[PDB]
Design an enzyme around this catalytic site. Structure first.
Site, mmCIF file in Angstrom:
data_model
loop_
_atom_site.group_PDB
_atom_site.id
_atom_site.type_symbol
_atom_site.label_atom_id
_atom_site.label_comp_id
_atom_site.label_asym_id
_atom_site.label_seq_id
_atom_site.Cartn_x
_atom_site.Cartn_y
_atom_site.Cartn_z
ATOM 1 C CB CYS A 393 -1.058 -0.118 1.117
ATOM 2 S SG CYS A 393 -2.216 1.283 1.132
ATOM 3 C CG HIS A 512 -3.656 -4.580 2.053
ATOM 4 N ND1 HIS A 512 -2.856 -4.122 3.068
ATOM 5 C CD2 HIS A 512 -4.472 -3.549 1.684
ATOM 6 C CE1 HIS A 512 -3.190 -2.851 3.327
ATOM 7 N NE2 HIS A 512 -4.173 -2.454 2.504
ATOM 8 C CD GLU A 514 -1.032 -7.190 4.060
ATOM 9 O OE1 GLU A 514 -0.195 -7.426 3.158
ATOM 10 O OE2 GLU A 514 -1.354 -6.030 4.404
#
Ligand SMILES: Nc1ccn([C@@H]2O[C@H](COP(=O)(O)OP(=O)(O)OP(=O)(O)O)[C@@H](O)[C@H]2O)c(=O)n1
Ligand SMILES: Nc1ccn([C@@H]2O[C@H](COP(=O)(O)OP(=O)(O)OP(=O)(O)O)[C@@H](O)[C@H]2O)c(=O)n1
Ligand SMILES: Nc1ccn([C@@H]2O[C@H](COP(=O)(O)OP(=O)(O)OP(=O)(O)O)[C@@H](O)[C@H]2O)c(=O)n1
Ligand SMILES: Nc1ccn([C@@H]2O[C@H](COP(=O)(O)OP(=O)(O)OP(=O)(O)O)[C@@H](O)[C@H]2O)c(=O)n1
Ligand SMILES: Nc1ccn([C@@H]2O[C@H](COP(=O)(O)OP(=O)(O)OP(=O)(O)O)[C@@H](O)[C@H]2O)c(=O)n1
Ligand SMILES: Nc1ccn([C@@H]2O[C@H](COP(=O)(O)OP(=O)(O)OP(=O)(O)O)[C@@H](O)[C@H]2O)c(=O)n1
Ligand SMILES: [Mg+2]
Ligand SMILES: [Mg+2]
Ligand SMILES: [Mg+2]
Ligand SMILES: [Mg+2]
Ligand SMILES: [Mg+2]
Ligand SMILES: [Mg+2]
Lengths: 541, 541, 541
Positions: A393, A512, A514
């Site tokens: 980001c 993102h 993750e």
């Protein structure tokens, strides 16, 4: 479908989330198509209102639905794609029924809690259980419902009254209830106490649900006397009192439930129609690994832990694939910022030594000005000393700010988030109408290391949450130097991946990574950071 | 301010509404500025969604707020003007807190039932208690809160938990609690039973409120043994167990509470700083009057009672001022309609004999086609046989339809509500932007009997609820005959009162005169109908 | 064995005794050997301590156990012989466990409510259920347990916790639970209310028993809406909500339970393996009989009703066999006593006219001096005017006192209970070691009318409760006249029956004939009094 309800006993913090995720995992391990619902009786409609300093992180689904932490925990343990309304906050049920009332979809009758709010809950649970949550596109066989709060809390009453009625409109062979309780062991005598779990089952049984299974949270294991005393007062056999003692990691909790026969109970209690061997080997690896690697996490929210919950999980899932015992070197960007020298240079100098001693560095997201120049100094160090780097980001946006500040030599280079007044404004607010949820990204080169890490397919699908992008006018001159915009939106409108060709490993991604990490398989950007950090990336490729 | 909470015990239907109104009346009788709140935990935002066939009538406030029956009951007993948010449905509290959540007026924190929904209830109650509900414009001294449902119902939990906290943020000298209970007397033995009121006070005391006063609903009076047994288990003296036995009319209930010393309790329990003599004389008049008058109520909702609750109350308040024992001759317009002759002429003929034997006739409001031609036949009879007539809302519109149908001789004359396709369409949908709440009306003549009945002032203020009005093009030719448009909107846009000059008493009004009726003083249109019905109107004028 | 528990809901006085007796009757009617237990959590060990003025009568079993009214109600409806410990007062359980504690039958361990008091209750219920309560001498198939008090009373807690555990140590096919509840119908609206029975089942279900059957006590029958609303909240089908509306006599209650299918439920819920046709004909006879007979009951306890409960039941059981609609003319012996003339002759004169207008006269038992001379005047009238007479217990002793006072002419003749100082003391305290329970009596003549009434067998077995008998020295001279000692103890020690040969019907018996009366068959002394009272005795013989 079959339904399993998980209810909470004496206190919150007994671990319903790890028990509901473990019940999902042992059922997934049977070849069942499992699905899950988190009921959480706070008034917020969705997680997009939450302060990340106070509640912890906001998770993102394929829909662009901003949701609570515990649906990420379900996606990680069950290996599934969830939908925005598998999170069932009480504010959504009241807003749904109020909207039907104000439209006249209830035909002039008085609309009431027990006939109508309590019935919208049962309809929502049947509706959201049937949707294809698996990547095969199949309708699921069993739904695990976790209910937040505890029994006897007034926030839980609409939901416990809904499930009191639910167990009859779906027949008893299709609905089942697990109760989780505390079993204290006070240091004054060291005896294990059943008294608060006797009261908790009297209360749940009075509200009209009986436990099919009682799960006890305690430090040491249950003894034979306590399993018999709970069996007497809770109307379950000694064999249906389950023990969840303390363990070295969460990966052992599914193994406790299998070795206590919880799977051999549900396959008879619900008449239902391995993965846990990989899970057992993974749990043994976590315990036996001793060779160590340390990563600097440079982030403004580091005064709390679960503000980075998916990031630290994605690093841990990568570290086990790397076979190294990970250390997170947490750093506050506001300490690393030069201004700390004007209040106490010791806190500045230790923030620097915590960075300089790391084997690699990571810059996570999070809006607003606080500590942003400290991240520019972390990136400048990572580029100058050539220690391996990832930005997600804001970490991409700040990497082009640092490169334009120091390599293009623009002394006032900044994003228009932090200062709109500069010359050379390199990043601008560019609405998609915020860019939220699943989107496609295309590779614009064959030379990238990030392309090899993603398995060398020509496109990605990834989860976004942002509104600022690199300016198309300055983009022209940046690629005359070592910075390469590797990946883009579907006809080149927006920059999605950046890489520096002069450096061992230095990359930014707009999405993102993750949220798509899993215990069995890390997502490529974090695995790339660790492979570069242990120096093995060149051998892996 | 001081606050009094009224809570319900063993069942609903014990009469909290008449007890809360009586508590308001005995406190008003001390010269206190009283105000009231009705809490009613259904999900409906306001009464405008209700079907009048199912829930009973919709009441209208000066705001144009459409509200439940029980705020009309407060306006009648307390003699006050209420505001739309002195009705506190649970759907309004959840919509209010959800809107603050979606705006971010809670700063990213999780929004929760006990810290936030339960606190919006306490804020709303303090806010709506302070507003000037009296015609003097003064801030009130005491607020009577009535809580709907019963203790231990899950719908009541947010409100009982709010008042559990409220009694400490306002000090104990400022908050007080009345509990209403059933005291059964089963025919098997005839002994009065305290057991269900012992359980009800154990439950209320467990939720954290103690009764300051226990009020027992039973058929026969309490004996000394039952007042002592309730005093033991409920922790109140024998003198604070109050008895509400059955009585001939609601006007005696304030007198039961005075003679049992309930006023002499609150003026010490709350340290607070006659009208009941008029109330006692009014109650004795209702019992002793024997000379009788009968009024035809021609209405589609007559398959239920409280669908006309304010109309029948306004007639009863007029009948006591007329000193006659009233009979309501209920008639269904769909039986009176000619079409009944094609299924069973006996039901048609008795609907006619029920009309023809009445001393006068009334046409109330209510949208939609059903039975509308039967009302035209009732009006045609009332004009032809010259028995006295009143029409309210639709009763005015239908009077100009009958006059245009039969006197102007337009065989297809109708409103565009019932048929848009006719020639001579005499009434049309004319939005105010619905015309709702308090509005001004001006008299356009000195000759009207309705002008004399209103006390001969040049204007009215009255409460409306409609969207159809008389066409300005046909209005021109109607006033060439005996029909006079007596009263209008503030610059003549809309017709508000009509009168027929050829007839003993025949009038239409666009507004609802019933909502401004009071036990001490009827509203003029209903008092005019009864004065004409007993023939005394010419002597009164 | 199978077990049925009857539990009480909202209040006491809902009629558990008639429901438990009716459940016993419909099961007896299937050919099952039924037995019963009354649990009644007062501290009294047995009924022998009770004042008959305050609690009502004391019942007597074959054991000489003095027991509460409700075991007589079981003996009458089920047609069985009960044992002293089928009444299970809480004081007996605590005394039993305390005696085991003080003997060391618990081996030095702390003795506790839930492990031990609660286990003595389960042992006592299994032990007293197996005994041969039927006259066939067979072990019973089903035990009906009635529990006194209501759910949530602290006196009921040891017993509800005992039955919570009991339903598992006997398997579920062997234990079943009936809950009796009030369903109010308040005159304010006339709607039937389920709310207090929803709370009562939430409380019973919280204490760990679920109703298998819910029985509603209400004045009017249940409607379809209330049976469905109770089925929802109580987890029983609409078909298992049973209605017990008001009826003309107790004999209809078994017929309500049969026509609602309660017998067709237990023969599947408990897997168990007609008399009700006689019961139906008996119930119709009670309703249709109109020809009337009146009996004077001359008794000191007549300021209350259930102080003579078995006597008035034995008269009623005789009156239906006589086919006459009975009137009890209650008379207080203390009003009939001459001394009333010195305070108000009107109360004396009406006590006389109430006697003189009766078709026959009865003198029941009861110790102490009060009103005893008034009974001597009643007997003197009955002998002089030759209206038919019966005396039971004291009524025999007082008959020989009157005969010795007036026929032998002994002006001071009295019993040594009332005055020990007289000449000619005709009755004396003669201990059996009190003469209590079942004993044999032998006829000493063939000429007696009482012998013919008992079916002309040479001996009786009957139930006694006394300590005073006729003196053997005065007995010699009494039988020189018309008074005959018809019946005696097994070798002539004590006088048991007396008869006067000069009179239409005049007899005394030492025992209580009322306890052996049954709905299908009256006991002979009361049937003899009524046959003589209607004058039909000479035709019957
Ligand atoms: N499969 C899971 C489940 C839980 N957790 C983590 O464990 C902590 C909380 O555990 P949880 O089971 O959810 O218990 P609590 O949150 O403490 O309590 P509750 O039962 O109310 O959820 C959080 O950091 C959560 O992200 C995790 O890493 N993986
Ligand atoms: N009588 C109550 C009390 C609390 N809550 C709910 O409790 C939730 C928080 O749960 P928990 O943390 O377990 O309650 P705490 O009071 O914070 O308990 P603890 O001190 O153990 O953390 C809040 O959302 C609140 O709505 C409720 O519904 N009814
Ligand atoms: N001051 C009052 C109060 C009540 N009523 C009428 O009495 C009936 C209901 O009485 P209420 O006191 O409100 O009791 P319930 O509605 O039956 O029960 P609850 O306590 O829940 O309100 C309604 O027709 C209502 O309009 C009335 O005429 N005047
Ligand atoms: N909290 C209580 C209150 C009463 N009792 C028991 O209640 C019994 C009497 O029952 P009941 O007559 O139904 O109670 P009452 O108080 O008399 O109820 P009611 O007024 O309806 O008659 C007593 O033996 C007493 O031990 C109890 O155990 N616990
Ligand atoms: N088979 C029965 C049962 C009851 N009764 C009489 O009915 C009255 C009481 O009825 P019961 O069923 O025992 O109800 P209650 O005593 O009022 O209340 P409870 O349920 O507590 O026993 C008493 O006069 C009792 O003797 C009777 O004549 N025959
Ligand atoms: N466990 C329950 C049961 C009912 N209700 C509420 O009860 C209200 C209606 O009250 P009431 O009429 O008194 O409940 P009933 O079930 O209809 O009781 P009754 O049969 O006596 O009329 C409904 O709005 C419903 O939300 C509740 O909150 N919790
Ligand atoms: Mg959790
Ligand atoms: Mg212990
Ligand atoms: Mg009301
Ligand atoms: Mg009592
Ligand atoms: Mg009884
Ligand atoms: Mg109701």
């Amino acid at each position: 479908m079959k339904y399993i309800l998980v209810t909470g006993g004496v206190i919150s913090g007994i671990g319903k989330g790890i028990i509901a995720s473990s019940v999902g995992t042992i059922l997934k391990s049977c070849g069942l198509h499992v699905t899950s619902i988190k009921i959480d009786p706070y008034i917020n409609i969705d997680a997009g209102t939450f302060s990340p300093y106070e509640h912890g992180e906001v998770f993102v689904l394929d829909d662009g639905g901003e949701v609570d932490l515990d649906l990420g925990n379900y996606e990680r343990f069950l290996d599934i794609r969830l939908t925005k309304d598998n999170n069932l906050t009480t504010g959504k049920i009241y807003q749904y029924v109020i909207n039907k009332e104000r439209k006249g979809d209830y035909l002039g009758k008085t609309v009431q809690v027990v006939p109508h709010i309590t019935d919208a809950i049962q309809e929502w649970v049947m509706r959201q259980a049937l949707i294809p949550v698996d990547e095969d596109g199949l309708e699921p066989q069993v739904c695990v419902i976790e209910l937040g709060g505890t029994v006897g809390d007034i926030e839980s009453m609409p939901f416990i009254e809904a499930f009191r009625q639910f167990q009859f409109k779906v027949k008893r062979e299709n609905f089942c209830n697990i109760h989780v309780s505390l079993v204290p062991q006070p240091s004054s005598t060291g005896e294990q106490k059943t008294k608060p779990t006797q009261n908790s089952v009297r209360e749940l049984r009075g509200l009209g649900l009986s436990p099919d299974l009682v799960v006890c949270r305690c430090s040491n294991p249950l003894d034979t006397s306590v399993k018999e005393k709970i069996s007497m007062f809770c109307h379950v056999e000694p064999e249906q009192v389950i023990c969840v003692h303390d363990v070295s990691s969460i990966y052992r909790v599914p193994l406790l439930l299998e070795e206590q026969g919880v799977v051999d109970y549900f396959l008879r209690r619900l008449d239902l129609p391995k993965m846990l061997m990989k899970w057992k080997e993974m749990a043994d690896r976590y315990d036996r690994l001793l060779e160590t690697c340390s990563i600097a996490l440079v982030g403004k929210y580091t005064k709390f832990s679960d503000s980075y919950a998916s990031v630290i999980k994605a690093l841990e899932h990568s570290a086990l694939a790397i076979n190294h015992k990970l250390e997170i070197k947490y750093i506050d960007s506001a300490d690393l910022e030069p201004i700390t020298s004007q209040e106490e240079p010791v806190r500045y100098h230790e923030a620097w030594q915590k960075l300089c001693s790391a084997h690699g560095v990571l810059v996570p997201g999070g809006f607003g000005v606080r500590g942003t120049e400290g991240k520019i100094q972390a990136i400048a160090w990572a580029r100058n000393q050539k220690k391996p780097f990832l930005g997600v980001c804001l970490g991409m946006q700040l990497a082009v700010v640092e490169f334009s500040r120091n390599v293009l030599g623009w002394q006032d280079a900044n994003s228009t988030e932090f200062d709109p007044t500069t010359s050379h404004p390199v990043v601008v607010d560019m609405p998609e109408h915020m860019r939220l949820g699943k989107r496609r990204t295309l590779f614009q080169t064959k030379n990238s290391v990030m392309r090899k890490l993603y398995g060398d397919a020509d496109y990605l699908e990834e989860r976004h949450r942002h509104r600022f992008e690199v300016n198309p006018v300055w983009k022209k001159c940046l690629e005359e130097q070592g910075l390469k915009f590797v990946g883009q939106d579907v006809e080149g409108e927006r920059m999605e991946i950046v890489e520096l060709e002069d450096h061992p490993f230095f990359v930014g991604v707009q999405y993102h990574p993750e949220f798509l990490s899993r215990p069995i398989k890390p997502s490529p950007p974090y695995f790339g950071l660790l492979l570069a950090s242990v120096g093995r990336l060149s051998h892996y490729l």
